[PDB]
Amino acid sequence: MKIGIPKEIKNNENRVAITPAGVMTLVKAGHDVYVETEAGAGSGFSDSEYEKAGAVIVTKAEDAWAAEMVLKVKEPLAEEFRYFRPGLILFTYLHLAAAEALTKALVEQKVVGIAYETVQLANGSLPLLTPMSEVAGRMSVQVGAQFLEKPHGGKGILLGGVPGVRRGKVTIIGGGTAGTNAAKIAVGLGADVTILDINAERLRELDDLFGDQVTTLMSNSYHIAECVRESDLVVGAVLIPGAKAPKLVTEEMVRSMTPGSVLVDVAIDQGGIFETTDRVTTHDDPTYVKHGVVHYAVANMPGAVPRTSTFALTNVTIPYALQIANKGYRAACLDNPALLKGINTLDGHIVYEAVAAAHNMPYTDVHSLLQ
C-alpha cells in the first residue's frame, strides 16, 4: 500500500503519526511511505532521518494526503476536509461524537475513518489511549512541582524537602494508568504520597508495586476530603470509561486547603473531577487561582513532551497500520476484532453506534458492510 503522513496543522501540535522506526517497518514489508517535509520537526525527526529509513519526503500536504492510507495524530480541520477522496483510509484520533462538520464530510466523501480512541481489546481496554494516560500521569506531578514554586503562584516548597525539612504531601485520586504513573514521579521527587481508588484489588496491586513508598486508601467522600485538606498537590486521575468525570473534589474541600497548594486535573479532557475547575487552561495560560489554590487544567499535557508522546503513541498505532497496509483495511479488520472496533465511518455510513447516536444521524452495523 501507498501510506501518507502529513504534518499536523492544529495549532502548537508538535506530535507526528510516524517515526523513522515505523517508516522502516512499513518500507521493509513492501509499502511506499510519503512524509510531508517538516512533519517530524516538532518531535525532533528531521526529513533526512525519515529518508534514510526509506520514506519519500513530499513538498506538499496534498502529496501525503494523496496516499491510500493517511496516518495522523489529530482530527482533520475545516481546511483539510477538501483532501477526502472515496476509499481514502484515515487512521488518527477522531472523537467524532462532538465534531459534526468532520463526521458529515467523512460520510459524504466515503472516507474509511479509523479512530485511535475506539480500537479496543476483548478485556475492554483501549491500547491506543493508555500511552497518553501514561505520559499525562508522569507530567502531572512535574507540573505540580513547578506550580508549588513561589514564582508560579505556589507556597514555595520542594516535594522532597531536604535533610531536616518535611516533604510535600501529594494525594492522587485514581489508581489506574494515569494515577500510577503520577505516583511513580511523586515518589521519585520525595513526596509523602497517598493514592485513592474505589477498587480494593487495584489498591492491593498498588501495594505490591509500591510497598512502603506510598499509602493506598479506599476512595469515599470523607477520605477524599481528609486527604485534600492536608495536600500540597492533588492530582485528579479518575476515568469512568464512557462518562463525564465525576465531581469528587467539592468547592468546600478546595476551601479547606492551605494557600498556594496546587490542583492538577488530568481528568479535564472528560470535564475534570474538581468542582472549582470552571474552565480548560492551556500550555500558554496554564493556571488560575480560586480560594488561594492554584488550578491547572490543561488538556493535551502530552503535547508538552511531543518527542516522548510521539514514540509512545506510534509504538502501538504503527503495528495496526502495518496490518491495514499488508492485508487491505478489510481483511485486517475481519482478522483483528479490536482494529474493527476502530472503524468510525465506512462507505458513507456511520458504523460506530454512539457517534451516529450523538449527531442525530443514521447507524449502519459495521459487520453487514464488511461480510
Added chain:
Amino acid sequence: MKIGIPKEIKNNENRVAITPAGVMTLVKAGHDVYVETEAGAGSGFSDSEYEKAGAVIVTKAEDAWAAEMVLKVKEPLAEEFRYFRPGLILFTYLHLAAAEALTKALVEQKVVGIAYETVQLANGSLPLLTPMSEVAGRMSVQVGAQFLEKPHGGKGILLGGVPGVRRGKVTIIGGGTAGTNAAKIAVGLGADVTILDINAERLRELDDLFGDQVTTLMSNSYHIAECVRESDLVVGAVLKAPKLVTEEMVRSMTPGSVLVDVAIDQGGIFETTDRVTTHDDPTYVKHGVVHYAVANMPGAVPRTSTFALTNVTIPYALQIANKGYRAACLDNPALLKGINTLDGHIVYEAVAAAHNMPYTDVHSLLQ
C-alpha cells in the same frame, strides 16, 4: 538579648531569617524577639504564628534593626546602611569580599558583622552554606525537566520516558552536596544518570549511596565532552569554578537540550553562560541549547529554604544571645570564623585582601 528579624527587602526575596519554631527556642531561653510585620509572609509564616511563638510584631523595619542582634538572609542594601550603629550584632549572608561599599559601612559604624557563609567547622565544611547547596541541587533537575518541555523551549521529552520509550540522559558534573542532591532527583524522575567527580573516594561513596541507580565517572575533559555530547540535561555542580564545559561541547549537543548551573552567581562551569537571568525571563538559547541562568534557585522555594537555613542558623544565634557574641565566638571556633567586621576592623583575611583594606587579628580584639 533583644533580637530583631526585619523583612528581606531585596527584590522578590521571600525567605526570612526565623520561623515560629526559632522564635520559641529564643523566647524560652529568655530573649525578646521582634519580627517586622510581613517578614515571614513570603515563606507562609503569618505575624499571628510568630506572635503565638512569643515574638513582638513591630510595624517598622527600624524597630527590628534597633535590636542588639539582627538576623537576616541577604546582605544589607545601601538603603539599609542607615540602621548600622556601633556594637550592633548582624548575622546574615554578607559576601563581603564582593561588596566594598557594605564592608566600609560595617567598618565605619563598628558593626559586629558575622557572615553565615564563613562559619566553618574544624573539618573545613561551611555548615550555614550546605543547606542552600542541598536546595539548589534538588531544584536543578526539577527546573531542567521543566525546560525539556517543548512549550518552555526544550526538545519535548520526559526524563523518565514511559514504557517502551527511552529515558532522558542527565550528566551531573560535581559529586559534592549540590550534585548528590541533583542525582537523587534525576534518579527519581527516571533518567539515565552519570555523575562525574575528580575525587576517586567521592566516586566510591557515591557508588555506595546509589549503586546501580547511577554511573559514577572520573572527571577529565574527554569524559566531560563524551557525556555532554549525549546529554539531554547537564547540571553544573562544582565549587571561581573552572570552565569545564567548552563552547565546542555545547555546540556538540542536540537542540532543545538544557544546561543548569548551581554555581552561576560564581561564574559556573559553562563557557557559554555570558550572564545571570531572573525567574521573570529565565533562559536564553545558544547553539539551539537552553541555558537556564537564574541565580539563587533556592529563592524559588522560599518556605523549604527558610526551614533549611534557619534549622542551622538559629542554634548559632542562640549561643550569641545566651553568652554575648564575644564568649560565644571564644567558646565556638566555627562561629569565630563567622566574624568578618568587629569594632571598626576587618578580621577576615580574604575580605581585607579583596578591598586592599587593613586586616586585624580577631583573637587580639576579643582577648
Added chain:
Amino acid sequence: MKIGIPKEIKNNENRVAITPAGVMTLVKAGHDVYVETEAGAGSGFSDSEYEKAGAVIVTKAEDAWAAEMVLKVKEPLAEEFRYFRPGLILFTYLHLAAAEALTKALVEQKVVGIAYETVQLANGSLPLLTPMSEVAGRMSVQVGAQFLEKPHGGKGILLGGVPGVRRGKVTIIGGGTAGTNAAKIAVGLGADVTILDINAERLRELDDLFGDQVTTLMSNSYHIAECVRESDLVVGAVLAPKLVTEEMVRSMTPGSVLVDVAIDQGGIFETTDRVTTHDDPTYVKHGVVHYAVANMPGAVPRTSTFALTNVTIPYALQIANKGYRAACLDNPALLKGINTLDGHIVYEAVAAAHNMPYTDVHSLLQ
C-alpha cells in the same frame, strides 16, 4: 504403583528425574520407588539420601526400567529401546516430532509415552518447560559475563564496571520467562539493561517489575539495530525469527558477545550457523563472540533437577495414585502429555512429522 528412575545416560547429562523429596512424596502415598545407583550423583544426590527417603537402590538400569512407570529427563536413546514393553508408562522430555526411530519404537512396543513438554494448561502455558526457560534465562547473562573476559575471547569488561568506570550494556530481546530472568541477572551484575518486546502490555509489566533498573523499548528492526550496535552483550530470548541480521552484528564492537536462550530451536541471530559444546564453546564472526552451546540448564544440573522435579512429580503422583487413564481423564493438562498409547500416535504434530497415522487420544481412553 512401582516407579523407576534410571540414571540419564546421554553424554554429560547430569540431571535426574527425581530427588529425595520426590521419593518421599511417592513412598508416603504408598508407591514403591526404585532408583538406579548413581542416578542423582551428577546433581549431588547420593544413593543414601534416596534410601533414607524410602527408595530401593537397584544395581542395574534393567531393574529401574522394569517398574510400571519410568521417570526420566531426556528421551530414550537407541540402546534403551530394549527396555520398552507393552503397557510401560514413560514420563520424560520426548520431542517425538524430531525422533522417528524413538516414535516407531514407542508405537511397536505399545508404550504409554507421556511428554513433559506437551503437558499444557487451559491458558496455553507448558508448565514443565517453564522451569528450564527460567534457568536458561538466569544462565544466559552469567555466560555472557564470562565471555566478556579477555582470556575467553571478549573485549575484557565487567558488566557493572567499578567506581569511576562505565558499565557494560546488555540488550535482552524478548521479555518473556527467559528474557525477564536474564534481565534480573543483567541488573544484578550492574549492567545498563534494555529489554525489547513487541507486546506493549508486557513492556508495562516489565516497567512495574523493574522500574528505573532497566529501560523497556518497543521491538522493531530499527530499535533492535540501534540497541545491538551499542551492546556489549545481546541475549536472544524470543519464542524463531532472525531479528538480528548480519549487518547488525557487523555494526558491533569487536569482543562483544551474543547468547541465545533459543539456540537448539534456531535462535534470533542470522550469524549463528551452528551449535557448539563446552570444550569449544564459541566462534567469532565480524570480531563478535558467538556463544552457541545448547542446553545451558545442563551446566547447573542440581538447580535444574530441583526446578524440573518441583513440577513433574505432582503429575507422576497422579499417574501413580489413579493409573494413567484416570489421571489423564481427571487432568486435561496431563492428558495433553500423552503422545503414544497402545500402539497409536495420539499427538497430531508427531504423526504429521513422520507421515504416520494419528488417533484421537479420547477415543482410546474412552
Added chain:
Amino acid sequence: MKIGIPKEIKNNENRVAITPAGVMTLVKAGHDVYVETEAGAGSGFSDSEYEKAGAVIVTKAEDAWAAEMVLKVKEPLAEEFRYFRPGLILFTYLHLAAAEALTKALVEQKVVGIAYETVQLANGSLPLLTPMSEVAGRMSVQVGAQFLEKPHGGKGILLGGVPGVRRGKVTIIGGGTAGTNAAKIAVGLGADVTILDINAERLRELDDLFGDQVTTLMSNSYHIAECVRESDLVVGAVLAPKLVTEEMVRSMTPGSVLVDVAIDQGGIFETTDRVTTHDDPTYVKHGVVHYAVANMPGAVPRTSTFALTNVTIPYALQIANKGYRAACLDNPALLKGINTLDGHIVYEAVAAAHNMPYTDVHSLLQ
C-alpha cells in the same frame, strides 16, 4: 615533558598505562605523548583513538622508552633493562622487595623508579592499589559462579537459584574494598550472603550499606568454621593469615568453590598450596574446587585499564607539569612513590629485602 607508554610485554598482559582521555589531559597541558603501536589493543584502544586525542604513535618500544617519563602497568622484565638510562622517570607497579635484579638495574642506571603501589595518602590508604582491589572483588564472585557450574568441576547450582529452588550460600571473609565489592556481586546474583569482619565498626557500616541483603557476622575461628561448612562459595578478601584450615575445607560439600582475592599474596586458605593459570585454573582437594589464578583484574583489561589510569594520570600530570622533584615536594603521597633515585634505594623495606644501603629520599631531593 615527553611521555612514553610502551606496550606491556609480560605474557597475556593486556592492560595499558594510558587511555585516549589521559593522552588528552597530558597534551592539553602541553606535554608530548608517545604511545607504542598496539599498546592499547588488548584493552580495545586503537592507535587511531590515541592519535585523535593528540598522541604520536611510535613503531618501536625503543621510541616510547626514549621519553623522559615512561608510564607502565607492570615491572620492566630483564629484556627491558636495556632501555633504562640515568635520569629516566619510570612510573609503574614495581614490587621491588620481590625483584633484586630489577632493583639493581634501577640503581646502576640511576632511574627515578616511582612505584604505583607505595603512593600513600596521609590516612595510610594506597590510592593506586584500591582500584585493582575493587576489580578483583567484583571478579571473585563472577569466577565463583562459573566454577559452581558442573562442566567446570562444580556441584552445578546457580547462586540465585530459580523460583521454588533454594539459593547458593556465599561467605565473604573480610569486609574491606575487595570483600565489599564481592558482596555487591553475590547479592546481585541472588546468593544468601554472609560477610565476616573482625572490625565491629566495619560490620555496622556494612549493615548501613547492605541492610537486609546480607548478614554481617563477627569474625572468629568458630563463625568461620560454621560459615565455611555451609558455603557453596567462600571468597577470601582479608588483608595474610590462614583463617580457613584444612579441617574447615574437609567439612565442605563436594563441588563447593574457594576463591581468594589475595592469591599471589598467600591467601587465607591453608589448602591453596600453589597458584595456577587460565588454561588449568583449578585443583580439587577434599572434593572442593580451589580457584588459584593470580591477577583476576587481568581478565578484564579494559575495565582494569580505566580504573587504574583514572587515578594514575593525575599523578603523572603533576610530574610532567613540575618535574618529579617539585611534584614530590608538593605532594607527600607521590613522594612515597619514589623507590629509586640517582643510584640510591630510598624505600627502607626494599633496601632491607636485598641487604642493600637505604638513603632518606628527603636528603636527595633537598
